[PDB]
Amino acid sequence: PFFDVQKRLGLDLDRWMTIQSAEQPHKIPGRCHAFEKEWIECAHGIGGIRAEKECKIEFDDFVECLLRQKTMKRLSAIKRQRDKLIKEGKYTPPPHHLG
Amino acid sequence: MFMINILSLIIPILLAVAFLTLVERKVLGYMQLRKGPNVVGPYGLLQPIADALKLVTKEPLRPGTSSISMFIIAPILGLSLALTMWVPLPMPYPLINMNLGVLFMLAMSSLAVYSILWSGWASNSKYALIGALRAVAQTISYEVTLAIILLSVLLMNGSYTLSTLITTQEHIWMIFTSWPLAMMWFISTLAETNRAPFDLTEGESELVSGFNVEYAAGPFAMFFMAEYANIIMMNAFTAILFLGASHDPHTPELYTINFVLKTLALTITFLWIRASYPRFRYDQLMHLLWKSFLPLTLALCMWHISLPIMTASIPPQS
Amino acid sequence: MWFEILPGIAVMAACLFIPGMATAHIHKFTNGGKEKRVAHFSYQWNLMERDRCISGVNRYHVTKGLENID
Amino acid sequence: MTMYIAFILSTIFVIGFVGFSSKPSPIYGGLGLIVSGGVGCGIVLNFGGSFLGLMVFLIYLGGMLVVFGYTTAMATEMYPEVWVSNKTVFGAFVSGLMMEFCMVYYALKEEEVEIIFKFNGLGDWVIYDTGDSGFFSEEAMGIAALYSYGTWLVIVTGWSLLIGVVVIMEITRGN
Amino acid sequence: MNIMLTLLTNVTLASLLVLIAFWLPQLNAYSEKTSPYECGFDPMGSARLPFSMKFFLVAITFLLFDLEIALLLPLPWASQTNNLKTMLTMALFLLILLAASLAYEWTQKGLEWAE
Amino acid sequence: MNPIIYTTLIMTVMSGTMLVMISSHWLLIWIGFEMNLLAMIPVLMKNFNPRATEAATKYFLTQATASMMLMMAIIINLLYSGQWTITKMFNPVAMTMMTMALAMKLGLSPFHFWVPEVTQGISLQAGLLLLTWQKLAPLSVLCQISQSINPNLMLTMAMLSILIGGWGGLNQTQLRKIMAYSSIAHMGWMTAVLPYNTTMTILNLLIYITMTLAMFMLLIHSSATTTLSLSHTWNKMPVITSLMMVTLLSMGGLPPLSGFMPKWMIIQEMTKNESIIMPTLMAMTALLNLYFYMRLAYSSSLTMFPSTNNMKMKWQFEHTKQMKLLPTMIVLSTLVLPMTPALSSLN
Amino acid sequence: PGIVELPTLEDLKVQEVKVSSSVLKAAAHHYGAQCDKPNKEFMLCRWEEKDPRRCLEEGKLVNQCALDFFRQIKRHCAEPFTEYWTCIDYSGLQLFRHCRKQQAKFDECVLDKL
Amino acid sequence: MPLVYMNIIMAFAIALAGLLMYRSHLMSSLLCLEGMMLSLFIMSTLIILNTHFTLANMMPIILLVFAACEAALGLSLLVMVSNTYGTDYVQNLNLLQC
Amino acid sequence: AGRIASFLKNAWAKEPVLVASFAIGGLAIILPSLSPYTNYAIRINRATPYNYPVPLRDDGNMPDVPSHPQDPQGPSLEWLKNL
Numbered sequence A: 001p002f003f004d005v006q007k008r009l010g011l012d013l014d015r016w017m018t019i020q021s022a023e024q025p026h027k028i029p030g031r032c033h034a035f036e037k038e039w040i041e042c043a044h045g046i047g048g049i050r051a052e053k054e055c056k057i058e059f060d061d062f063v064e065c066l067l068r069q070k071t072m073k074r075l076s077a078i079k080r081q082r083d084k085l086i087k088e089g090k091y092t093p094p095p096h097h098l099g
Numbered sequence B: 001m002f003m004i005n006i007l008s009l010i011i012p013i014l015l016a017v018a019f020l021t022l023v024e025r026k027v028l029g030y031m032q033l034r035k036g037p038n039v040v041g042p043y044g045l046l047q048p049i050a051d052a053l054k055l056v057t058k059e060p061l062r063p064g065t066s067s068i069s070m071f072i073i074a075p076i077l078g079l080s081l082a083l084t085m086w087v088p089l090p091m092p093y094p095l096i097n098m099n100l101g102v103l104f105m106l107a108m109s110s111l112a113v114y115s116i117l118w119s120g121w122a123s124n125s126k127y128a129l130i131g132a133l134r135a136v137a138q139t140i141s142y143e144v145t146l147a148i149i150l151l152s153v154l155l156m157n158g159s160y161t162l163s164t165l166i167t168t169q170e171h172i173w174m175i176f177t178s179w180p181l182a183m184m185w186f187i188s189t190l191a192e193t194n195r196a197p198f199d200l201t202e203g204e205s206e207l208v209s210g211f212n213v214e215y216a217a218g219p220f221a222m223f224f225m226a227e228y229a230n231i232i233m234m235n236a237f238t239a240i241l242f243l244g245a246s247h248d249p250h251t252p253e254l255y256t257i258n259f260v261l262k263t264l265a266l267t268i269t270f271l272w273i274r275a276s277y278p279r280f281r282y283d284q285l286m287h288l289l290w291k292s293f294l295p296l297t298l299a300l301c302m303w304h305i306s307l308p309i310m311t312a313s314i315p316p317q318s
Numbered sequence C: 001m002w003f004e005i006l007p008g009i010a011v012m013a014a015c016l017f018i019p020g021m022a023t024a025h026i027h028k029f030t031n032g033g034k035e036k037r038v039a040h041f042s043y044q045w046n047l048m049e050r051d052r053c054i055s056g057v058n059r060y061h062v063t064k065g066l067e068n069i070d
Numbered sequence D: 001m002t003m004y005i006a007f008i009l010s011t012i013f014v015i016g017f018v019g020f021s022s023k024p025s026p027i028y029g030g031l032g033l034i035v036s037g038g039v040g041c042g043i044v045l046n047f048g049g050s051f052l053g054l055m056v057f058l059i060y061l062g063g064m065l066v067v068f069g070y071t072t073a074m075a076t077e078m079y080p081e082v083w084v085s086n087k088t089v090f091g092a093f094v095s096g097l098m099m100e101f102c103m104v105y106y107a108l109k110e111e112e113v114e115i116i117f118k119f120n121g122l123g124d125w126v127i128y129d130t131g132d133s134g135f136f137s138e139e140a141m142g143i144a145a146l147y148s149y150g151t152w153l154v155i156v157t158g159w160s161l162l163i164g165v166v167v168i169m170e171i172t173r174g175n
Numbered sequence E: 001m002n003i004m005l006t007l008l009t010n011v012t013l014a015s016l017l018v019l020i021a022f023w024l025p026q027l028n029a030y031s032e033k034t035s036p037y038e039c040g041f042d043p044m045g046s047a048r049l050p051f052s053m054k055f056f057l058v059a060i061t062f063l064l065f066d067l068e069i070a071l072l073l074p075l076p077w078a079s080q081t082n083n084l085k086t087m088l089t090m091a092l093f094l095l096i097l098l099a100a101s102l103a104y105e106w107t108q109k110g111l112e113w114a115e
Numbered sequence F: 001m002n003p004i005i006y007t008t009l010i011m012t013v014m015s016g017t018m019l020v021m022i023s024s025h026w027l028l029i030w031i032g033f034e035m036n037l038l039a040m041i042p043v044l045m046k047n048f049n050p051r052a053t054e055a056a057t058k059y060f061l062t063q064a065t066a067s068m069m070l071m072m073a074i075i076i077n078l079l080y081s082g083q084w085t086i087t088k089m090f091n092p093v094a095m096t097m098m099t100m101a102l103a104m105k106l107g108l109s110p111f112h113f114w115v116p117e118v119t120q121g122i123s124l125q126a127g128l129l130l131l132t133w134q135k136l137a138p139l140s141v142l143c144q145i146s147q148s149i150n151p152n153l154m155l156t157m158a159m160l161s162i163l164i165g166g167w168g169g170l171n172q173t174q175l176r177k178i179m180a181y182s183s184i185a186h187m188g189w190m191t192a193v194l195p196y197n198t199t200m201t202i203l204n205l206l207i208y209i210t211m212t213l214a215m216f217m218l219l220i221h222s223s224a225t226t227t228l229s230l231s232h233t234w235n236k237m238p239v240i241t242s243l244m245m246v247t248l249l250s251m252g253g254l255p256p257l258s259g260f261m262p263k264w265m266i267i268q269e270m271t272k273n274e275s276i277i278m279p280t281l282m283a284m285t286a287l288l289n290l291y292f293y294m295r296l297a298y299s300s301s302l303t304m305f306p307s308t309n310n311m312k313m314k315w316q317f318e319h320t321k322q323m324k325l326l327p328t329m330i331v332l333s334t335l336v337l338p339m340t341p342a343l344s345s346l347n
Numbered sequence G: 001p002g003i004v005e006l007p008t009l010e011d012l013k014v015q016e017v018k019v020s021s022s023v024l025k026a027a028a029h030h031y032g033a034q035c036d037k038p039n040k041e042f043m044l045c046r047w048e049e050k051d052p053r054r055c056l057e058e059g060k061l062v063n064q065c066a067l068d069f070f071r072q073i074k075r076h077c078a079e080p081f082t083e084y085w086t087c088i089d090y091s092g093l094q095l096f097r098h099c100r101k102q103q104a105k106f107d108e109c110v111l112d113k114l
Numbered sequence H: 001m002p003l004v005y006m007n008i009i010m011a012f013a014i015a016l017a018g019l020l021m022y023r024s025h026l027m028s029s030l031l032c033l034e035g036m037m038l039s040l041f042i043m044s045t046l047i048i049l050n051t052h053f054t055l056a057n058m059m060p061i062i063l064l065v066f067a068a069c070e071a072a073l074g075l076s077l078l079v080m081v082s083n084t085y086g087t088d089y090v091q092n093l094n095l096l097q098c
Numbered sequence I: 001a002g003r004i005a006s007f008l009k010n011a012w013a014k015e016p017v018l019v020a021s022f023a024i025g026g027l028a029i030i031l032p033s034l035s036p037y038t039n040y041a042i043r044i045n046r047a048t049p050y051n052y053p054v055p056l057r058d059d060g061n062m063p064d065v066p067s068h069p070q071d072p073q074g075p076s077l078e079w080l081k082n083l
């Protein structure tokens, strides 16, 4: 903050909730607890400028964890080719597809 | 077979509402030493049928200065909401076992005011307009106490699941723990449901017929059906909340006997009140709620939040 | 006198009687005599989905136990 | 169908928003907004947000917008400005029904809609997460933390609400 | 599956029930029949005027009051927390401030709304 | 309004701004902005004139819209990063989104259209609060998030702020509208240096604070709102018009007066950042502020405008106000240039 | 950027318990304490190894250690099991409170039989 | 990013336009303002529910209770305008001008 | 003293409502501190096992944790069923 009074007197006002890998009720996790914990500990005591590029791997992985863009695109391309192929009758889904 | 069960729920209630006009007419007359409908069929049993199909065969005159689309949507919302009020009820085993049924109960009940506001505006008459404006004004004042009462009452229950109320009252009626709230909840139900003394919404004597001052024949029954359907449901809601009943899993028949018998007793005391008290007034209507009801509800809510902690009697959330 | 209103309310008791009986018996009938196993939490739901898959007939309400294992 | 049911609820949400955003009669705008208010709750319900979904019904459908009807009953411009009254509102309503119809078709065909953000038009169901919540409803435990960890928010939210009532009577007192 | 199906059934039940209450009775309305009813006398042209402040004032107080009660729905699950003392203090705060807002509103006229 | 009620209303407004400057969580930042807004309107409503009602309505609509638009910047940043911490955010659209959202609160770009009109409607004391204290909260966020800003987008917003803010000032009779146009012009100077080095963005803030307290409380002491009304004050109290012309010259930025210290340091910084055309143009537009500054100074004390025979009563009586902190205000607002290297204390 | 290594379906063909939910719930208390050692080993692996594929060997062990728990009761009083889990199955929430007599009868054997 | 998120985001943007593109009833303007926050309230629930940010389930109510507070101010100003002017028109709400 | 008793009784003469609510709210806040069962309430609240008590890696010299969910070691709640 502009005036980090919280740090000075050490009373936690908001930071208990600023990130999802902190203490959570009944100790139940967020969707990306594993990833953001990795990114946080990567970018501690480093600085915003350095952590932008050095801890890039932990970031886009964590961003992909909660956005799930490329994973969804992966499934979309899988599904798109499926209907672009089975409609031509080139491959038939096995029984476990249909139960 | 989920469908047939649905008609098995909505159809009997509509026929129950029709017969509610007859019994109320007779019981209210009996207080007045009258007899009530007894000529149309044995003990007036066919009076609801006579009233129902006479009004249906009466033309639904639309007022000249009315938005027809606006005039028609309000009964649809009013009647459908009233019938939807029963879908989470813990009747033997609740139909829609919504884990937050009480919130679902309150949200739908609070959404009923849109029928009042829209009917008054669509009618487009000063008498109907101020009749509706005060009607909702009476309406919107009290459910804050409804919410506070439920929050205090449900606090010792465990959650908002309506089915859980049965296991909470497995030994004694829940009224004994919160009888100050029981009368608090009961009076507020009359204000929501708009019966005397809280009939200034309609005010047959002094507001002609309230928002139904013009509303005639065809869709007038919808407000009348929705109104009287809420009477059973609010009394049924009070019956489960405070006057709980034992429920044997191998015989849900028995608890239905207890639940049903209680909810006619709760409806009977509704019109019993109507046949004894003068009609209230708009200012007293607000003053009673905001000056002597809200403070008491707050304190009782404060009493009931801390009560489980000071007694180590918090209920399981399940 | 007031025995003439009892015919009115007795029918009333019958009207409110029906919805309780139906939803009780349909739940009993559909779910093989047992009541509808409610799932207010995800634990109870995935309990049922295990039962539906484990029944061998794709209905949860069909219960089948020690006769299976060997 | 139930494949893309949340696709539907999102769609009436947009057309409901286009309704009142087209500046129709304030009651009619309220009608269009509460329709969006009603359908939006289903979107949250489909995600398991029952408690959050039920609240908007309580304090936003049966809450804010009810007192909105009072001002509409208080304003009462000399003639209703319902959709037939003006032609720009029809144009606003008609227009707002085009581009969202355009981009859904754009998103339904190739799914590479790049309006401002890159967006996938895949089925709504995908982004859901698989995992049991045990016996504790995650929505309920989150809100109940209001009185466990949300101490600071409770004071500020309460204090502002107290200041909320002091201002309202002071501005409305008319000196 | 069943939830909106239950919602769907009621709405159709209501709409047909008014539909056979609208087309069946053979609507035969005239000009005087559709004329507004005003205690049997002539309407002078109205229902388009503001109504002072009291109805508005109570609505806003209700809205503000409804918002605070919205903050205290989660109490039944709040009692199931591990730290009751913080929860007991905090929930008491909302109620006493709810009292204080009522207390001020009472003292400075307020609920005795304008006439 | 009851003084105890008035004191509390100011107390929350101060705390709301204080809340913004002390919150590490984006939601709490929004909380401070809204509850500061929630108590700003009644202060503007203290006089309760139809002009004030128009002013307060205008102020609320723009501030509520900006604050509501601010939420998406938080939500979009949340959506793409899942971080409520107020730091360098991770979305160009979100970064763009909030920059105009905060700019509308400050009123730099065409967004500035509410700034003059609201000041005109509401009282002099309320205008003093609105143009001085209500500018700390939006600036606090920008200082913290300065590292994420698009340089082109913010520099532009600063440019039109000084550009239009100074340009329209030549055509204002009412002193309240003059002050607001000066405020918009001064808004650009701090905002321009904001992406480069935040230290002298603050330095401009306290200094710009000093004159506006100095000018407005001088104007309140004068009890004048128009140029002609200000002109008559030479007869009653010629001394006050003398100090006002010092501040008018100082706020214009002529050396060695205090108002030159910000602009000088601002030019120095962007000159270090290789931006040398940008400082030059703002300096050229700085004379635009000086013109109507001179026009007021010409009308106030440099010349001697005609008075009215009814001024004779004012001679007999005396002022009952206490103008707290006025003595030290103007002195700290006119001669502090020799103490310039003290800006490292802000760092 | 690599291979999501997945075990072949061969090691996944492990014997699975085929019993309705109420059967597990009825004997859950008499199952947890008496098969704890493999259960704790598997779930320790789940939280320590943090990867599903690492605990495959233990995953079939608990399932196997469930079966030899679900076999002797057949060679012993399986009859009190029948109505007990039947009565528990009748409950919508599988509440033990209603069906306590059959719980006592079930508990009476395993105090002496096993 | 999922198609639904467009629907709320576009809902806000068209709600934002209605708030800015005026007409003659600032009452209607307030509707776009509270609709504006409804999309904000709605969308915020999706991410928080989706990502299981349990403690973040906080803000949908917190954003609600504060956006609702602006209704108190906004509607109160409505009747104030509708008292010195009687109506809720916006073209006449230009007394400031100079 | 005399004024307090008179004022309280006199207030109870005109308004019996707010004095009743004030008394109830007055009680609602003090005895929560004075109650001896609040510590019991938090103890049973902590006693509810919503989550799985994940086993701890046994490496020797922690005698407090049992090696079996029947051993006397570890936390016990024999007060609870009596409570």
Ligand SMILES: CCCCCCCCCCCCCCCCCC(=O)OC[C@H](COP(=O)([O-])OCC[N+](C)(C)C)OC(=O)CCCCCCCCCCCCCCCCC
Pocket: B179, B180, B181, B182, B183, B184, B186, B187, B197, B242, B273, B277, B288, B291, B292, B293, B296, B303, I014, I015, I016, I017, I020, I024
């Ligand atoms: C350790 C103990 C803890 C708990 C202790 C609690 C305190 C002791 C108990 C106090 C009484 C119970 C709580 C308060 C109840 C009254 C609230 C109130 O405002 O009363 C005065 C109020 C107002 O009385 P008033 O208006 O004459 O005076 C109020 C005070 N002044 C004048 C200052 C405003 O009474 C009413 O509102 C009258 C009833 C109105 C509704 C009409 C229908 C009544 C039907 C009655 C018969 C049916 C009853 C059904 C009951 C439920 C059945 C399921």
Ligand SMILES: CCCCCCCCCCCCCCCCCC(=O)OC[C@H](COP(=O)(O)OCCN)OC(=O)CCCCCCCCCCCCCCCCC
Pocket: F237, F238, F239, F240, F241, F242, F245, F246, F301, F302
């Ligand atoms: C950087 C460039 C300059 C910037 C500043 C320029 C300011 C002036 C510019 C022109 C202003 C407009 C034209 C003139 C306006 C005059 C205003 C006015 O009120 O004039 C008349 C007035 C009459 O005087 P009066 O108020 O009665 O006070 C007399 C002294 N008691 O006169 C007054 O009120 C003036 C009173 C002045 C009092 C001066 C006191 C001096 C004390 C010196 C002490 C020295 C101690 C030395 C110690 C040495 C050892 C340590």
